[model samples]
Target: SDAFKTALCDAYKRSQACSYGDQCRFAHGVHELRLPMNPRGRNHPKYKTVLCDKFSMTGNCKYGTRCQFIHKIVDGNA
Candidate 1:
């Protein structure tokens, strides 16, 4: 249940205006999203994928498809 509440807001991720307000079921800000501080160790089962910092930041990662982390570019152009 705790993991469910820590989910990232879909509207926020999609660059849409969220209308949930106080009833929002997900994190409102980037800082509010919960990610494993140290991915070198195990993470919560609720977490399906951890955003790849290298890929997300520079649009590229050395690990490529071998990397366990998810590669996602959060662009607002959509």
Candidate 2:
């Protein structure tokens, strides 16, 4: 059951509207997630801000750097 909590929803990651929005089983935003346990069974750093999904794919965020969402590449533990 816990495993599901660490996974990001497909629609959410794609910046599409989810029918289950706000009630989905998987995560809708990065802040609602935690990194999967590493090889040593230790948890990675927690995400403090949501990532700009648009910026992730196009390198051009509509909100720019002040969107309050992170713009880094989608690394597993970032």
Candidate 3:
């Protein structure tokens, strides 16, 4: 159960930039799922959403890639 929780948490953390009021773009995946630039917000309409590689998650600003944040999915327990 902990693993699932952790995985969910990791997913959530990775999705923080997808939240509401955020300047991230919402890209539609295979199933029309919205993928944000950074991560999704906790109360985002697309919360708990998963994204496929086909989806184009881009930023509106010119300096998008300059951000230094990475989504790190932990492999094992801490």
Candidate 4:
């Protein structure tokens, strides 16, 4: 429900927000979820093998495989 409306700017983590702004299909704010913000993301109900958002994006996640939070289904998978 919330996912359909809430979205993280692809470059949000890289800096602050994407230049696209409102024209983009995503959203940006403290409420936007990504990476370590989402732990159990690897087992994504859809992606299945998706890695931790923090790990895939920043290269690390303190929770490893013990966290669960996702929705920033962008690129940088690893």
Candidate 5:
């Protein structure tokens, strides 16, 4: 049981960085920002930078012209 609990905890921690089933949107067609594995590698992940044209929340990515939430997605491929 301890092993199972540890595994579950790890999964929770990893999933904490996942953005799924959220209406949070940013920019014009950007929604659900996800952090990339490497925020400074070009061509890191194709879907790393997702653009949604359905949701737009307040604190999505339009608060400060310099948002770090979505930056991770871009950085992962740069």
Candidate 6:
């Protein structure tokens, strides 16, 4: 289809998301970035605060910023 949007992934799945943002080769709109769902492994009393593995690789942990596990944008040169 010739239809496209300049927004982020409002839908749940990744397939229906805009990858390149403004540089994307399709019609798009100004929409807020869609954050992922909270991860499950966190929020447990027994589990200590740790860095999210998923977020480390793909930059998505499916866990909120307040999750028990932490995920920071560590500077490579830092």
Q: Per-residue alpha-carbon lDDT of model 2 for 33-66, expressed as tens digits? A: 7658568857666443877778777767887746
Measured by TM-score, the strongest candidate is 2
**Candidate 6, which ten residues in sequence have the lowest lDDT sum?**
1-10
lDDT of 4 at 57: 70
Q: Which stretches of model 5 miss by more than 4 angstroms?
A: 1-41, 45-55, 59-62, 71-78
Worst 10 residues of 2 by lDDT: 41-50
Model 2 has an lDDT value of 0.73
Rank the models by lDDT, top first.
2, 1, 4, 6, 3, 5
| Model 6: pairs clashing at backbone N, Cα or C within 3 Å | 5-28, 6-28, 6-29, 37-62
Can you write out model 4's per-residue Cα lDDT over 1-78, one digit (the tens) per residue?
344325567665576666776565555655543323345567536433554668557756676555564424466545
Model 2 misplaced stretches (Cα beyond 4 Å): 1-4, 39-78
Clash-forming residue pairs, model 5: 39-75, 40-78, 41-77, 41-78, 42-77, 42-78
Candidate 6 wrong stretches, greater than 4 Å: 1-48, 76-78
Error of 3 at 9 (Å): 59
Worst 10 residues of 3 by lDDT: 1-10
- In candidate 2, how many Å is residue 41 off? 9.3
Weakest 10 consecutive residues of candidate 4 by summed lDDT: 30-39
Which candidate leads the pack in lDDT?
2
Candidate ranking under TM-score, highest first, comes to 2, 1, 6, 4, 5, 3
Candidate 1 lDDT over residue span 1-78, tens digit each: 465446788886796677885577788776776654555656456332778888877779898878878878778552
Candidate 5 residue 27 Cα shift, in angstroms, is 51
Q: Let me know the TM-score candidate 2 reaches against the reference structure.
A: 0.39
Total clashes for model 2: 0
lDDT values, one for every candidate: 0.71, 0.73, 0.33, 0.55, 0.32, 0.54
Predicted candidate 4, C-alpha RMSD: 19.5
- Model 4 segments beyond 4 Å from truth? 1-6, 30-78
Candidate 1 global CA lDDT score: 0.71
* Model 3 stretches with alpha carbons more than 4 Å out: 1-67
